[PDB]
Amino acid sequence: FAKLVRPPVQIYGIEGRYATALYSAASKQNKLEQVEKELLRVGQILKEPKMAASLLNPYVKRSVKVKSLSDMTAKEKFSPLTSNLINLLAENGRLTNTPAVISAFSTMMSVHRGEVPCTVTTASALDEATLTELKTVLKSFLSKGQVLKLEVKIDPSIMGGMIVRIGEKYVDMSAKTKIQKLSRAMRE
Amino acid sequence: VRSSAGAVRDAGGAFGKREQAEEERYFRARAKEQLAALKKHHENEIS
Amino acid sequence: TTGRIVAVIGAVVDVQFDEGLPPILNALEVQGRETRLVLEVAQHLGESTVRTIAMDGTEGLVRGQKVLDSGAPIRIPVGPETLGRIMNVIGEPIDERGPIKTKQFAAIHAEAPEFVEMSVEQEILVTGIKVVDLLAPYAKGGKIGLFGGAGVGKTVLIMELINNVAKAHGGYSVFAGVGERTREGNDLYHEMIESGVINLKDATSKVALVYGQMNEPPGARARVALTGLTVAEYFRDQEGQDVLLFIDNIFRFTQAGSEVSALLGRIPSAVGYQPTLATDMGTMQERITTTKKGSITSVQAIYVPADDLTDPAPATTFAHLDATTVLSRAIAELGIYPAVDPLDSTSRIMDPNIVGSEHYDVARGVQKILQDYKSLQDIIAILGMDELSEEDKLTVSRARKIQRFLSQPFQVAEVFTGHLGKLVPLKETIKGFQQILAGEYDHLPEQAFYMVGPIEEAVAKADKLAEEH
Amino acid sequence: KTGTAEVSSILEERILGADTSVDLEETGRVLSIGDGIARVHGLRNVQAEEMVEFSSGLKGMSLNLEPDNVGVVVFGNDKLIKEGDIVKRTGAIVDVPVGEELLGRVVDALGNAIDGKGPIGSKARRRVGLKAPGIIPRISVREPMQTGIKAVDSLVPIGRGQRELIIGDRQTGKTSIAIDTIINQKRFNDGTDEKKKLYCIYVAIGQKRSTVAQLVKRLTDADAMKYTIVVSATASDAAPLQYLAPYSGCSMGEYFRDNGKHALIIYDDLSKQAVAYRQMSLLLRRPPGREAYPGDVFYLHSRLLERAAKMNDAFGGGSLTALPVIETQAGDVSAYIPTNVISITDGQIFLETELFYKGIRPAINVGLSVSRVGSAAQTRAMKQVAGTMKLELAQYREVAAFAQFGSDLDAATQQLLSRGVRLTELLKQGQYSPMAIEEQVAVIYAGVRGYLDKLEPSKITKFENAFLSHVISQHQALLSKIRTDGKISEESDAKLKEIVTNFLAGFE
Ligand SMILES: Nc1ncnc2c1ncn2[C@@H]1O[C@H](COP(=O)(O)OP(=O)(O)OP(=O)(O)O)[C@@H](O)[C@H]1O
């Protein structure tokens, strides 16, 4: 078989297999950015209430669905890769999980351009200077060229401190966990 | 479903043990008698 | 080639290859293990993944661990240097004595001999056991089975055979312990060292051992039989010589195959067995054969789960054997040891044109009298012995004498009985049973015949019983 | 949901328009391979049960045609097949060579010689999956198929075009019945009567190679290979070969049937073909039924056994007797495959282990044995003696319980016991020593007229032998008269009376 080039992050499931096929197809011929843009476009194109209502009805024949999607793709001047992907999803009847495929490819492309999602949780909000030093130190965690994608949620359930997720790495300087630790060890 | 020879002692219920004992007691008795006769013959054939 | 673990479920590991896949049955080596873990490819799942069974514990495996592809099936060391040693499934030594230094490595998977290689000659193999020699005589180059449940004498009988045949056998010998207690493996190692078949000093060892005991994961138990079979095959072909091959039990091969089938995605068959039971057993039992280039005498112990001879595993194994000796628990309860069932054992050579008309007629007379005894036992359960026709009591007496006379003391069962082992030449067994049937002993008591060798020993025991009466 | 062809490799191919350079009509790429089942992508123009050929020289049969893929069963070890291989159509359903060029040759399930005696003649080929005849071509079973065994020919007659069934336990004598039947046909094949010659086919499914080699040696010893084919599908063979071998044998026999000759095919053992089919079905993920057997396992054996017919003179008059062998486990004729094949066939020769060791070998258990064809498949002389023998044996079987007591019972019961014991000792037979029909009828005639009520039962087996040798040597004219004539004429009856009395007059 053709030795497909594996994606950076392995997505699994039906969407995973379709997205890995698309990523392998695009990586050769080097059309990853354009194909991602076209995927974002079809993200809205199919979402149109008329098109969505006409594609979620399993009593319109697959022939009609494929013909309509071919017409839309021609009317949008897409890459042959994206047009063939939409045709393939339509033939296999996998349109109901098309947004899953776009989301999978988005996740797969983000890692391709070197991004490590991050999460910070605190009892209350932060002052922008402190967030700046957080940016600096977290970038210290990352490797060379690995952009960061910070997300700062606010969880009052914890009693203070901070919680940081960087990929699968996790550091919990939160008051609640330390209270729990002392209460347990002291209880013993 | 059929029946075969030597099945009463294959089940091993009450009849199986009863039959085993009815056999063993009789043959212990006969073995005792035969051993007595063997001793008598031994003694009578020394000369 | 280099691949990458992508799943670990029990003993089944899924390995993904970016380059070309490895063929089925190839051995792969996991990189990053203190010991040697070898996986064997069993399926291609598509998307470059291959499913495999691990020949060792899959603890501490990490999704992503690199794997090397050896390019060939598991290759074990073979030759005269393996004699006196012990081995795993993967051939590395487990006797703590150093590397096995051979020039030949043999893959454990091979095609069975073709039909144009079969030997069609049979001649009795005299083992020195009365019941075996009389009713189910063995044959040189033939495959022997020892069926029976747990605790009936399979291991004792096989040890007894090693004591007799292997000790006085010019050719080599192989013992593959498949999924049996490790205590027994150590006991055999030390008993062989004591006897002298395994010599730790010189290079005069006559036995090569392979052990896959029941602490191993199913992958290793399913393949240690093939490892022992490969050693035996080499000694058959290249050495061009007679070989013995003892296996204990060859039911653990089937069972170990059944412990991974469900995880390989196969629907089960009749009783929680893999769908490939008969094919998997045939592709192994068909390499244990006496071709025209050599000759393997194969003795196999076959566990019969819950004494059920109609279970799929023993039922299928029956068709691959020339001689069978179905040890029976109902006879071991009576104290008749070995508990070989005279009516449920058979041999191929048991024909008047191979053994002789005297041997054949004696055997058939014994079997007929025992069957008549079984028929009578139903009546005795109602009438009683006192009410039988004076001819029937004669049948019962002869049947009980013959039942006891088949018992024999082994040289390896000294510990249990405390008696001394006896080897009975074939002519003496034939004479003894012919006389017992002819009525030349219808005065000696039954117990005189219990656990003795030739018939004269029964006469002497009866004399002693009478004197101290 | 999910499909097996939705793997990312196929989708990758199809996204960048690389699916047009690959011919997906007559070639395919293996998606999966495991436990002897390959799942192939493509082969869109492949017929059900067609034979495909893998790139590595192996063959396979395409059984499961699903929307996504084709399920091929490989004819050998799947060691050589790897995911991504190339599978090409052969174009033709599986067929085997046929003709008199196979006689005396050992072949495997596909007609390849395995005895190393050279290529196989093979002028004609025949498809193994051919529909059996219909209602009209057949005609009632009338001719006898001389088994050479006293019990089978006397109390369980087998005609030509009949499907008997040698059902029994393990190590009871089934293969011995088959081999004696095969060996007894030499007296007809050697002769010149062209409507009595029977050609034999022995299908050996799932037996080890040593057994088949010994069997071939046994046939060669008896000079009974020159008219025998042996089709081996031994244990080491892949499941599809064990599954096909009965059909290859049946087609090699249908050749003889279609051309006016007569054939005997002995599917030994069918309970192993059922197991091989069960394997193939379970690995193809087909829905299991009772005991894990697929649903269409009755179909598998019925479409095989219903090809044993007796064509009429407007089609040639040939015939194909079938003698399927089945191994019941304990005594269970109510299991699945024993039930199916007992309901398919026309009779059964039921063998025992109680009888085997009681000294009654062959262990044919009459009373459980039956032949729904019956007297129609017997000669007139055999009818004459066997009617009385069967009646007397039936009388003896319902008072056999008293056999132990015997005495202290009326005279009628004593006579029944005595006659029954003599008759049972008469039906005993050696091994590989079949008997011509004249010999059998002479022996049974002596037995059933009371001429052995004086001899002790232990001496009946010696009488039978000595008397038979006597008549065979001194009196050939009477035996020839009975044989050619087919009946016992009054003068022949008187001659038999005088011969039996004169020999028995002094026997000692
Ligand atoms: N009529 C007979 N007289 C003497 N011996 C017999 C007779 N029939 C069978 N035997 C012996 O019984 C043994 C078993 O017979 P055979 O193998 O034909 O039965 P089987 O059911 O085919 O065995 P399996 O089914 O296990 O292959 C053979 O060794 C054969 O020689």
Ligand SMILES: Nc1ncnc2c1ncn2[C@@H]1O[C@H](COP(=O)(O)OP(=O)(O)O)[C@@H](O)[C@H]1O
């Ligand atoms: N020849 C014999 N004489 C006396 N006892 C025996 C003999 N063989 C086996 N036994 C009994 O059986 C036990 C060993 O059984 P073994 O053969 O090891 O089990 P298995 O056959 O299930 O592997 C011993 O404890 C012993 O009491």
Ligand SMILES: [Mg+2]
């Ligand atoms: Mg044991």
Ligand SMILES: [Mg+2]
């Ligand atoms: Mg047989």
